[PDB]
C-alpha cells in the first residue's frame, strides 16, 4: 500500500529535477551563468524488518564549472576570466560573492559595478575617475584616460582583484553570486588572496555553459521516468481498491 508513496516521491522529485533543468535551460544567453547540474539520491528507509523501501529524493550537487563560451564584443571593459577564476563582487547584504559575469559598467559617479552591488578589487569597491574611458589589462590593472587629455596620461587607477577557487569549494548563494562552502573556510580564509596568476582578457564576454544536449536527454529521460511512476501508481491504487473486498461478508 505504502509503495504508492515511493512512486509519488519519484514523480514529485522528477518534476523538481525538471524544474532545475528549466531554470538551467532558460538561462541560455545569460552572461557568465554557471549551469546547475542535478542528481537523484536514493534514501533507504531502514526499519524493523525486510528493508525494501527506498525513496528517490532530488538534489543538486553543485554548478557545472566548465567555463562558458566567449563573445568578442570589442567593448573595452568587458572581461573574460580564464578557467577556474572568479571576479569578486560585494553582495547586497555585504560579503564577497564571486561571479564570472564580466559585463562591467561604470556609473555616472565613476563607480565600477557589475550589475549593482559593485565590484571589489585591492581595497573597497573600485572607483574610477569620472571621465572614464576605462581600459582593463591582462592581470586586472585598470587604467583611465580622461578623453580630452594627452594619451600619455593613462596612469593606472585600480586593480581588479581575481580569485582562484574551483568546483567543490564554491557554492551558489541564492543570488547569482557564489561563496565558499563553509568547509573551504577552515582553509583559505573567509576572504581570499588575489592569486597573481589569473589572466583577464578584455573586450570579450562569457556566456552560459548550459550544454543543450545534456538538457535534451535529461528532459526525455525525466518524462519517461515520470510516466513509468504513473503506471506504478495506477497499479498500486487499483490493487488496493480491488483488494478491499476482503473485509465483506
Amino acid at each position: 500500500d505504502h509503495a504508492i508513496y515511493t512512486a509519488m516521491g519519484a514523480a514529485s522529485q522528477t518534476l523538481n529535477q525538471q524544474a532545475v533543468t528549466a531554470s538551467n535551460l532558460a538561462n541560455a544567453s545569460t552572461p557568465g551563468f554557471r549551469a546547475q547540474l542535478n542528481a537523484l539520491r536514493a534514501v533507504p528507509v531502514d526499519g524493523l524488518s525486510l528493508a525494501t523501501r527506498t525513496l528517490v529524493t532530488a538534489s543538486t550537487p553543485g554548478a557545472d564549472m566548465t567555463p562558458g563560451q566567449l563573445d568578442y564584443t570589442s567593448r573595452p571593459l568587458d572581461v573574460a576570466l580564464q578557467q577556474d577564476g572568479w571576479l569578486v563582487v560585494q553582495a547586497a547584504d555585504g560579503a564577497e560573492g564571486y561571479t564570472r559575469n564580466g559585463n562591467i559598467q561604470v556609473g555616472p559617479t565613476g563607480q565600477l559595478t557589475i550589475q549593482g552591488h559593485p565590484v571589489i578589487g585591492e581595497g573597497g569597491p573600485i572607483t574610477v575617475p569620472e571621465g572614464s574611458e576605462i581600459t582593463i589589462a591582462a592581470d586586472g590593472t585598470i587604467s583611465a584616460l580622461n578623453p580630452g587629455d594627452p594619451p600619455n596620461t593613462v596612469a593606472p587607477v585600480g586593480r581588479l582583484k581575481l580569485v582562484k577557487a574551483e568546483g567543490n569549494e564554491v557554492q551558489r548563494s541564492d543570488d547569482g553570486l557564489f561563496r565558499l562552502t563553509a568547509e573551504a573556510q577552515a582553509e583559505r580564509g573567509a576572504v581570499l588572496a588575489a592569486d597573481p596568476s589569473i589572466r583577464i582578457m578584455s573586450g570579450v564576454l562569457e556566456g552560459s555553459n548550459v550544454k543543450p544536449v545534456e538538457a535534451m536527454t535529461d528532459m526525455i529521460a525525466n518524462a519517461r521516468r515520470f510516466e513509468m511512476q504513473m503506471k506504478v501508481i495506477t497499479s498500486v491504487d487499483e490493487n488496493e481498491g480491488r483488494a478491499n473486498q476482503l473485509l465483506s461478508m
Binding site: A22, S23, L25, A26, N27, S29, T30, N103, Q171
Partner: protein, 52 residues
Amino acid sequence: MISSLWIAKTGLDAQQTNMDVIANNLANVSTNGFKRQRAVFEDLLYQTIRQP
C-alpha cells in the same frame, strides 16, 4: 501552473525580448547616429529547499 511551465515561460519571454532587441538593431541600419542595443539578462533568485 507547475514550476517548470512558468520557468520555461520566462525563458521564452526572454528569448522574445532578445529577438525584439535584435530586430530593432537590425532594422535601424541606415539610421544616422543609431547606437546598437545589446540585451543582457540575469538569473532570478534561487529558492533553497534543503540545505547541504
